[PDB]
Curated annotation (Swiss-Prot), chain A:
Its main location: cytoplasm. PANTHER family: DNA-DIRECTED RNA POLYMERASES I, II, AND III SUBUNIT RPABC1 (PTHR10535:SF0). GO terms for cellular component: cytoplasm; DNA-directed RNA polymerase complex. Belongs to the archaeal Rpo5/eukaryotic RPB5 RNA polymerase subunit family. PROSITE patterns: RNA_POL_H_23KD. It comes from Sulfolobus acidocaldarius (strain ATCC 33909 / DSM 639 / JCM 8929 / NBRC 15157 / NCIMB 11770). The keyword Nucleotidyltransferase applies. Keywords: Cytoplasm, DNA-directed RNA polymerase, Nucleotidyltransferase, Transcription, Transferase. This is DNA-directed RNA polymerase subunit Rpo5. InterPro entries: Arch_Rpo5/euc_Rpb5, RNA_pol_subH/Rpb5_C, RNA_pol_subH/Rpb5_CS, RPB5-like_sf. It comes from the Archaea. It is found in: Cytoplasm. GO terms for biological process: DNA-templated transcription; transcription by RNA polymerase II; transcription elongation by RNA polymerase I; tRNA transcription by RNA polymerase III. Its EC number is 2.7.7.6.
Curated annotation (Swiss-Prot), chain B:
This is DNA-directed RNA polymerase subunit Rpo1N. The gene is rpo1N. One of its GO terms (biological process) is DNA-templated transcription. Zn(2+) 1 binds at residues 57, 60, 67, 70. It comes from Sulfolobus acidocaldarius (strain ATCC 33909 / DSM 639 / JCM 8929 / NBRC 15157 / NCIMB 11770). One of its GO terms (cellular component) is cytoplasm. It catalyses: RNA(n) + a ribonucleoside 5'-triphosphate = RNA(n+1) + diphosphate.
Swiss-Prot record, chain D:
DNA-dependent RNA polymerase catalyzes the transcription of DNA into RNA using the four ribonucleoside triphosphates as substrates. In vitro binds dsDNA but not ssDNA. This is DNA-directed RNA polymerase subunit Rpo13. The lineage of its organism: Archaea, Thermoproteota, Thermoprotei, Sulfolobales, Sulfolobaceae. Residues 35-43 have a biased composition (Basic and acidic residues). Part of the 13-subunit RNA polymerase. It comes from Sulfolobus acidocaldarius (strain ATCC 33909 / DSM 639 / JCM 8929 / NBRC 15157 / NCIMB 11770). The chain holds residues 36 to 78 of 105 of the full protein. It is found in: Cytoplasm.
From Swiss-Prot, chain E:
DNA-dependent RNA polymerase (RNAP) catalyzes the transcription of DNA into RNA using the four ribonucleoside triphosphates as substrates. SUPFAM superfamilies: RPB6/omega subunit-like (SSF63562). Gene3D superfamilies: 3.90.940.10. Its main location: cytoplasm. It is found in: Cytoplasm. Coiled coil: none annotated. This is DNA-directed RNA polymerase subunit Rpo6. The lineage of its organism: Archaea, Thermoproteota, Thermoprotei, Sulfolobales, Sulfolobaceae.
Length: 77, 875, 49, 43, 86
């Protein structure tokens, strides 16, 4: 319908490989569902083809460090 | 063995449990007989509990201190509905068959639903809730039990607690007996799938067959000096329930009209439901004597005076005081002044060791009436001794050893908590060091007012004395005042100079100030300075010191600072080190060589100031030392110099008044031209506004420009070195609008952005013509406060300022919601922000893990400041 | 030079002799067993939320 | 089944796969294959 | 960069440094057990103040306290910090 990933309010989304996600959850000492959640029907989740059980690596713009990295866990809904 | 509480398990109270824990059975409805002794078997049975100081409980050999209340039970012959579980009984009724007691869903799907629910109940509670809601929604609308196919009838609930079937007759009412009998049929698995614990919350237990009787410990009798005992409302209701229980039982065994039985069954149920909760929607409140609604179990728990917010979230505490506050510039910023009366009443309990035994002995020698003394002595086994009833306090002092506890008066150096309400941020309550002084007031330093938002108009503050060693240590380590100079809201100091401090600093640091040895010794006598003054700045013809030279004695010998002063707003600004007006501050190697000290160098709430950099780069202890020494010099120099406000500081000559009059005439001519153009239809509007609305805008613009020009003229023809101008330009008090209004004119008065119009028809006052919209007719004041206002000018001025007199619940509600939303977040050793339940909120706090309290005004590092620190003495 | 004058002053009935109250220990409520309320009684300051 | 029930079941299956992978009872490739199978079967 | 460079900088910074909460806890515990009859580990003959909290502060300033801080990281790793002469 319309491509929204180029909007200035939308940060970069990236699907994270299983080995990298496994290493991340081991080094954080958590279960995957203890991260902030993102829905599989999210407009940006569908743009990259994200399925539930994945972890999305998000890079946002920051006034203190320039670039900041965040992780979200894909849920159903 | 001493344990701790690690959880609470909730459930519905089984009637077997109600009977088993009960100590008696309440059968009699008579509370007190002729003499006054309580009837055994009534509501006031002594078996329930003891509330009398001298009485002893029969159930347990304990007095009021050691006796917990004991429970009784009222036996109900006809079951009643618990009003607090109606929404659950309704769901159990609507989603279950009334013959076999099943969820009314095919067992093939039921088994897999149960499997999924058992798998997900603990990891995803929200998913389990949605699954249960879906099962209930698809099971309610079945109309035929798959196990029966018996044409299930729909059930409707009539408030508050009336259940109505819809059979072929379309009207039939369900009694609680049939409801409970239907709810007994449901198996444990079906209850568990519906979202309820079967072994702890069984659905038919929501239909009451036995009623617990609260203990008398929670049901006290108020002793009033009127001589009549007043009972609490719980007994006043329980007597009604027991009466109706007796009133209805005799009818069953004696006759059966079957219409008076149900007209009493609907009254006992009402009594029980109202005993559980009053203010039931669509139900009359219950009074006792004066038409005052009763207070019941659920009314003791809700509200701002209820159990939760009145006794659990907040409470009244011991060892606290409240008093008016007054200033004290002779205290440190860490200190608070305490009256002698309060010091002798509040006490700190100190355990006797081998290092402090002599000091404690000297405390004991002094009684409760001499400071510093003591009020009590506690022996190692745990007996207290009132020192005012001791025959000889000198022998008791000699007999104390290590292990005794002495509750002594407050002494200088004790740590207390000092608080002002409302407590909006955490530095609304800080730790202070006690100093006992004559008077009946709480004395506070003037630099400590901004954090408290405090004032000396009649304000009051609270005091709290920590009692244990750990609490005192925490208060001294984390809450001390000087450790909290920089606020966490932004990277800036919340403690700093005020009104006399700023003007005293300006007058001392100006380059014309010359001092003699005696004046220098007088100024430095209020500080801690002892040492060599060096040579005077001027050696001949006379030896003179400089104010900058004296100030430089307190700056660190490697401090560098370049920056403008507050007085550099006007033409004296040069934006470089070559300034003949002392507008640019130059500090090199801790030597004040140029510039003055004013609000932009030492004032409070000024981020990235010289004082802020000093505190940041030398520690908060240095800031405490600086505020306690240099800020007194400013006051002392004001005392020596003399600072007053006369009436010639705001009086302009006659030529200035003539110029202002000519400007006012020109403005009035412009307004008249606008009005004429409007009357002749040659006035263009502004987009989005009508004509006669644009004319008002033009008039307002013209009058505002007139006020600005008149203020400029008045400033031009006034002395730029009078005390009002000094107070204004330095930032101590006042603005340029105040000077303009006091010396040139008030200008146009307005109400909600418009001129003054409300009054008679087409005129505000009867003094003016019909339809007159000249500036004076609608609220333009052309006089100043110095010259005086006209009667109608005074009326217009009073009308303009009316809406400032009207000038919090929304702010409190928002802050409370934020506190309850965010209270569980913590910073981990990982650097991560996590909740106390383990959920991750931020991978790293902020973006660089920098505390706003340690920031250089939101910056982790100011690189220009570092460069100035390193090479500022040669730049 | 300092400005000296004569101004009419008034004393208001808000006096600190009727505004200060402290409590170390005292009576407690019969129900909640918490400190009492008011300067007429021994007192107790509320430590709110 | 229903969309909500399918979502709940796929969430449960993802949880089980992650639990088994985190206990070193599965390899990364087997977990990838099972995740793909669940995603395709519940699309 | 384990998770991020900022987290590594954080953990490296707090490796051999005490937070204010740890200092407050140590001082309060030492004062509480010093008021209960323990023997001071310093001279306590020419100190300015003879109360327990001042003695605990001076005992912490010059490392004589045989106390160890146990830091438990969220992944289960344990770090031990000793205040006895560091
Ligand atoms: Mg005030
Ligand atoms: Zn008892
Ligand atoms: Zn059935
Ligand atoms: Zn200049």
């Amino acid at each position: 319908k319309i491509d929204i990933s180029n909007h200035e309010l939308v940060p970069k989304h990236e699907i994270l490989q299983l080995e990298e996600a496994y290493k991340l959850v081991k080094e954080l000492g958590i279960k995957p569902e203890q991260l902030p959640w993102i829905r599989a029907s999210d407009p940006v989740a569908k743009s990259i083809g994200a399925k539930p059980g994945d972890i999305i690596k998000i890079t946002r713009k920051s006034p203190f460090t320039g670039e900041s990295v965040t992780y979200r866990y894909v849920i159903t809904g | 063995s001493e344990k701790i509480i690690r959880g609470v398990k909730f459930g519905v109270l089984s009637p077997n449990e109600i009977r088993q824990m009960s100590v008696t059975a309440i059968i009699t409805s008579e509370v007190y007989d002729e003499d006054g002794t309580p009837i055994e078997g009534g509501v006031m049975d002594p078996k329930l509990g003891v509330i009398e100081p001298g009485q002893k409980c029969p159930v347990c050999g304990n007095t009021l201190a050691g006796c917990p209340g004991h429970f009784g039970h009222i036996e109900l012959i006809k079951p009643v509905i618990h009003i607090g579980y109606v929404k659950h009984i309704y769901d159990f009724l609507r989603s279950t068959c009334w013959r076999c007691g099943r969820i009314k869903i095919k067992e093939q799907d039921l088994e897999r639903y149960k499997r999924i629910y058992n798998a997900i109940k603990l990891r995803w509670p929200s998913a389990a809730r949605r699954l249960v809601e879906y099962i209930k929604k698809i099971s309610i609308k079945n109309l035929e039990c798959p196990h029966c196919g018996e044409k299930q009838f729909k059930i409707k609930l009539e408030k508050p607690y009336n259940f109505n079937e819809e059979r072929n007759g379309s009207i039939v009412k369900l009694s609680p007996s049939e409801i409970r009998d239907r709810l007994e049929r449901i198996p444990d698995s079906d209850v568990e799938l519906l979202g309820y614990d079967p072994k702890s919350s069984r659905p038919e237990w929501m239909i009451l067959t036995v009623l617990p009787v609260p203990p008398i410990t929670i049901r006290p009798s108020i002793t009033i000096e009127s001589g009549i005992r007043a009972e609490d409302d719980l007994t006043h209701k329980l007597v009604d329930i027991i009466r109706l229980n007796e009133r209805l039982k005799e009818s069953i065994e004696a006759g059966a009209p079957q219409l008076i039985i149900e007209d009493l069954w609907d009254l006992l149920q009402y009594h029980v439901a109202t005993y559980f909760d009053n203010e039931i929607p669509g139900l009359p409140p219950a009074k006792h004597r004066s038409g005052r609604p009763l207070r019941t179990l659920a009314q003791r728990l809700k509200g701002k005076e209820g159990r939760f917010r009145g006794n659990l979230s907040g409470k009244r505490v011991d060892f606290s005081a409240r008093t008016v506050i007054s200033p004290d510039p002779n205290l440190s910023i860490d200190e608070v002044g305490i009256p002698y009366t309060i010091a002798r009443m509040l006490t700190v309990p100190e355990r006797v060791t081998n290092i402090n035994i002599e000091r404690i002995r000297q405390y004991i020698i002094n009684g409760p009436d001499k400071w510093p003394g003591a009020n009590y002595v506690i022996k190692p086994d745990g007996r207290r001794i009132d020192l005012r009833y001791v025959k000889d306090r000198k022998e008791l002092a000699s007999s104390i050893t290590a292990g005794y506890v002495v509750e002594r008066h407050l002494v200088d150096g004790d740590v207390v908590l000092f608080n002002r309400q409302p407590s909006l941020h955490r530095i609304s309550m800080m730790a202070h060091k006690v100093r006992v002084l004559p008077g009946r007031t709480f004395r506070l330093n003037l630099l400590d007012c901004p954090p408290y938002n405090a004032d000396f108009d009649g304000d009051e503050m609270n005091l709290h004395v920590p009692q244990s060693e750990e609490a005192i240590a925490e208060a001294r380590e984390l809450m001390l005042v000087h450790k909290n100079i920089i606020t966490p809201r932004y990277g800036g100091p919340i403690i700093g100079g005020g009104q006399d401090y700023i003007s005293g600093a300006y007058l001392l640091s100006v380059k014309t100030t010359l001092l003699t040895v005696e004046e220098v010794a007088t100024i430095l006598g209020v500080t801690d300075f002892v040492g060599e003054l060096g040579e005077p700045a001027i050696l001949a013809p006379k030896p003179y010191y400089t104010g900058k030279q004296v100030i430089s004695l307190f700056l660190p010998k490697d401090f560098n600072f370049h920056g403008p002063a507050n007085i550099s707003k006007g033409p004296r600004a040069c934006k470089d080190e070559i300034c003949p007006h002392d507008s640019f501050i130059v500090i090199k190697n801790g030597l004040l060589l140029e510039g003055v000290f004013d609000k932009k160098a030492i004032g409070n709430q000024q981020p990235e100031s010289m004082l802020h950099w000093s505190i940041r780069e030398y520690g908060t202890e240095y800031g405490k030392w600086l505020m306690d020494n240099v800020f007194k010099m400013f006051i002392r120099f004001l005392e020596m110099r003399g600072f007053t406000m006369t009436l010639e500081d705001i009086t302009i000559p006659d030529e200035a008044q003539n110029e202002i009059t000519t400007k006012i005439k020109e403005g009035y001519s412009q307004v008249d031209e606008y009005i004429r153009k409007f009357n002749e239809g040659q006035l263009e509007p502004i987009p989005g506004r009508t004509i006669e609305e644009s004319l008002e805008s033009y008039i307002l613009d013209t009058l505002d420009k007139l006020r600005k020009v008149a203020g400029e003229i008045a400033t031009k023809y006034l002395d730029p070195f009078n005390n009002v101008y000094i107070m204004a330009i330095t930032g101590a008090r006042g603005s340029e609008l105040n000077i303009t209004q006091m010396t040139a004119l008030l200008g146009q008065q307005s109400v909600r952005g418009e001129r003054i119009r409300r009054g008679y028809r087409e005129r505000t006052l009867s003094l003016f013509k019909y339809g007159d919209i000249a500036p004076e007719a609608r609220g333009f004041v052309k006089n100043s406060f110095m010259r005086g206002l006209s009667p109608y000018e005074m009326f217009f001025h009073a009308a303009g300022g009316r809406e400032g007199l009207v000038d919090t619940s929304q702010s409190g509600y928002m802050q409370r919601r934020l506190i309850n939303a965010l209270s569980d977040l913590r910073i981990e050793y990982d650097g991560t922000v996590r909740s106390l339940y383990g959920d991750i909120v931020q991978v790293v706090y902020g973006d660089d893990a920098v505390h706003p309290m340690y920031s250089a005004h939101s910056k982790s590092v100011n690189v220009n400041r570092v460069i100035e620190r390193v090479i500022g003495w040669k730049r | 030079r300092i400005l000296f004058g004569i101004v009419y002053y008034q004393k208001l009935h808000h006096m600190v002799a009727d505004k200060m109250h402290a409590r170390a220990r005292g009576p407690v409520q019969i129900l909640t067993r918490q400190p009492t309320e008011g300067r007429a009684r021994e007192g107790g300051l509320r430590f709110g939320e | 089944s229903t969309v909500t029930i399918s979502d709940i079941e796929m969430l449960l299956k993802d949880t089980e796969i992650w639990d088994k992978l985190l206990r070193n009872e599965l390899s990364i490739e087997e977990a990838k294959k099972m995740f793909d199978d669940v995603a395709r079967s519940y699309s | 960069m384990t998770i991020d460079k900022i987290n590594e900088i954080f953990k490296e910074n707090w490796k051999n440094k005490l937070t204010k909460y740890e200092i407050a806890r140590i001082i309060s515990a030492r004062a509480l057990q010093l008021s209960m009859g323990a023997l001071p580990l310093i001279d306590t003959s020419n100190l300015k103040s003879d109360d327990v909290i001042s003695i605990a502060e001076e005992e912490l300033k010059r490392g004589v306290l045989p106390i160890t801080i146990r830091r438990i990281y969220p992944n289960g790793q344990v770090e031990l910090i000793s205040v006895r002469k560091i």
